C-alpha cells in the first residue's frame, strides 16, 4: 500500500475495533462480522456526498482529521482494490455497495461518477410505499451479488424516507493447508453451558503458530490462508463463557504480545463448517462514535449527493456471508508420518470465539467478528 492507504488501513482497523466494542455492549447483538475497509468506505461515501460538518464528522469517526479529502477517497479506493489481493476475486470474495434513494430523489452525476470510481458504488431508486417490494429489491440485489450465499439482508426496514447504503459480501477463507473434504461430522456448539445447538464441524491436525494464555484462560491459533498472503487468527476462551471478558483484552498492544509468544506446534483443529450470515445496521453505532449530523433528518447536509438538502443517512447495512469450508491448497501427506504430530494441542471450537482475518502483504485487517450463535439449520 501507498503511505496514505497504509495510514487509512490503520485507521479503518481502529474504527472496526471501536465499532465491534460498541456492538458487543448491545445485548440484542449476537454474531458480529465487520470488514474494516467496507465500514471505512461507508464513511468515505458520506464525506464524498456530504458538506461542511456532515462530511467533517465522517472523517472524525475514522480519526482522519489531518488528511486532505483527496487523500481520504484515493486511499480508501486503493484499500478496496487491495482486498482482492489475498483471494480469488468474484469466486471466494464478492462485494457490492449500493445507495438506495427514494423514488422522488435523483442522484447528481458528479457524485455518481466519483463514488463509482472511488468506491464501486451502485445507485438505485426505491419505492418505500410497498414495504414488501422495497425489501425484495434490496434482498434480491444482495442475493445476486453473493450468488445466493446471502439470500436476505433484512426482513424489515425502520427508517423509510432517507438514503439506504447497503454493502453485501461473501467471503470464504481458502486455507494454505486444506481440510480433507470427508473430515466433517455433526457436533454440539455450546452457545452457553445450558444451551447447545447442532453444527457441522470440519477437523484436521497440522502445524500452526499457537499460544495458550494460561493466565487469561484462552487459546489463540493462526491459520494461514492461500500462499500465506493472509491469515485467520482465532481467540477462544478455555471455558464456554460470554466473550465480554476476552473482548476487554482486545487491544493492539495485547494482540502484538500474544502474536510474539506463538510457537509452531501440532494442533488438532475442529471448526464449525457452513455459512454464517450476519447483517448489521451500523447507523446507530456510527452515530454513537461521532456521526450525528449525517443520520439526523434535519441537520444532514448531503447536497453533493443529490443537489438539494432532501436526503439523510437512514441506514448503513453491512451484510456478510462468511463461509467456513474445508477447501484450501493441497499439501504433502507425508507430514502425517512425522514425530511433531505425536501429542497435538486441542483447539475444539465448540463454544463462542473471536476471529480476525489479516492481509499479510499490507498488514491491513480484512475481517473482525465473533461466532456466538451458529444459524441453527445449516447441519448435514
Amino acid at each position: 500500500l501507498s503511505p496514505k492507504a497504509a495510514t487509512l488501513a490503520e485507521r479503518s482497523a481502529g474504527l472496526a475495533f471501536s465499532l465491534y466494542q460498541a456492538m458487543a455492549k448491545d445485548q440484542a447483538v449476537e454474531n458480529i462480522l465487520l470488514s474494516p475497509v467496507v465500514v471505512a468506505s461507508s464513511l468515505g461515501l458520506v464525506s464524498l456526498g456530504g458538506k461542511a460538518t456532515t462530511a467533517s464528522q465522517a472523517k472524525a469517526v475514522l480519526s482522519a482529521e489531518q488528511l486532505r479529502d483527496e487523500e481520504v477517497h484515493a486511499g480508501l479506493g486503493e484499500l478496496l482494490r487491495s482486498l482482492s489481493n489475498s483471494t480469488a476475486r468474484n469466486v471466494t470474495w464478492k462485494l457490492g455497495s449500493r445507495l438506495y434513494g427514494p423514488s422522488s430523489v435523483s442522484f447528481a452525476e458528479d457524485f455518481v461518477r466519483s463514488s463509482k470510481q472511488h468506491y464501486n458504488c451502485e445507485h438505485s431508486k426505491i419505492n418505500f410505499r410497498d414495504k414488501r417490494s422495497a425489501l425484495q429489491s434490496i434482498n434480491e440485489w444482495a442475493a445476486q451479488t453473493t450468488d445466493g450465499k446471502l439470500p436476505e439482508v433484512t426482513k424489515d426496514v425502520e427508517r423509510t424516507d432517507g438514503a439506504l447504503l447497503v454493502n453485501a459480501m461473501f467471503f470464504k477463507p481458502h486455507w494454505d493447508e486444506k481440510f480433507h473434504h470427508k473430515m466433517v461430522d455433526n457436533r454440539g456448539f455450546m452457545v452457553t453451558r445450558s444451551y447447545t445447538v447442532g453444527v457441522t464441524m470440519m477437523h484436521r491436525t497440522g502445524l500452526y503458530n499457537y499460544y495458550d494464555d494460561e493466565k487469561e484462560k484462552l487459546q489463540i491459533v493462526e491459520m494461514p490462508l492461500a500462499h500465506k498472503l493472509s491469515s485467520l487468527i482465532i481467540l477462544m476462551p478455555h471455558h464456554v463463557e460470554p466473550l465480554e471478558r476476552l473482548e476487554k483484552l482486545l487491544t493492539k498492544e495485547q494482540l502484538k504480545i500474544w502474536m510474539g509468544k506463538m510457537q509452531k506446534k501440532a494442533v488438532a483443529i475442529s471448526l464449525p463448517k457452513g455459512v454464517v450470515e450476519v447483517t448489521h445496521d451500523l447507523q446507530k453505532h456510527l452515530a454513537g462514535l461521532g456521526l450525528t449530523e449525517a443520520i439526523d433528518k434535519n441537520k444532514a447536509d448531503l447536497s453533493r449527493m443529490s443537489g438539494k438538502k432532501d436526503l439523510y443517512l437512514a441506514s448503513v447495512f453491512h451484510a456478510t456471508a462468511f463461509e467456513w469450508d474445508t477447501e484450501g491448497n493441497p499439501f504433502d501427506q507425508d507430514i502425517y508420518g512425522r514425530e511433531e504430530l505425536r501429542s497435538p494441542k486441542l483447539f475444539y471450537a465448540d463454544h463462542p470465539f473471536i476471529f480476525l482475518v489479516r492481509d499479510t502483504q499490507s498488514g491491513s485487517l480484512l475481517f473482525i467478528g465473533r461466532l456466538v450463535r451458529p444459524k441453527g439449520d445449516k447441519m448435514r
Binding site: H180, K182, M183, V184, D185, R187, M201, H203, R204, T205, A268, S270, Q333, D334, Y336, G337, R338, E339, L341, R342, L346, Y348, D350
Partner: protein
C-alpha cells in the same frame, strides 16, 4: 466396521515387522501405530502414518521378544472427545 480390521504381520525378521491392515468404513486422516513388549514396564513407542497407507514397517526390535501392536484410526469421530478406534495383535519376532 468403524475400527481398522485384519491387522496382521506380513513379514518378520529378528529386528523388524511389516504389518498390514484393512481401513475402517469411515475416512481416516491418519493412523497412530503403537508397539511395545507385552506386559512389560517400558512405555510404548509410537509413530503416525498418513490415512492412505494400509502397511507399516516397525524397526529396532529385539529378537525372540513378544510385542503388542496397536493401530488407531484417526478420523472425524476421534476429534473433540470421541472414542479411540484401535485394533491390537501380539507377535513374537523370530530369533533368526
Amino acid at each position: 466396521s468403524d475400527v481398522p480390521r485384519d491387522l496382521e504381520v506380513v513379514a518378520a525378521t529378528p529386528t523388524s515387522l511389516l504389518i498390514s491392515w484393512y481401513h475402517p468404513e469411515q475416512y481416516t486422516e491418519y493412523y497412530r501405530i503403537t508397539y511395545g513388549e507385552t506386559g512389560g514396564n517400558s512405555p510404548v513407542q509410537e509413530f503416525t502414518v498418513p490415512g492412505e497407507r494400509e502397511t507399516a514397517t516397525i524397526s529396532g526390535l529385539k529378537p525372540g521378544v513378544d510385542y503388542t501392536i496397536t493401530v488407531y484410526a484417526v478420523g472425524a469421530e476421534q476429534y473433540g472427545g470421541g472414542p479411540d478406534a484401535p485394533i491390537s495383535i501380539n507377535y513374537r519376532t523370530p530369533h533368526h
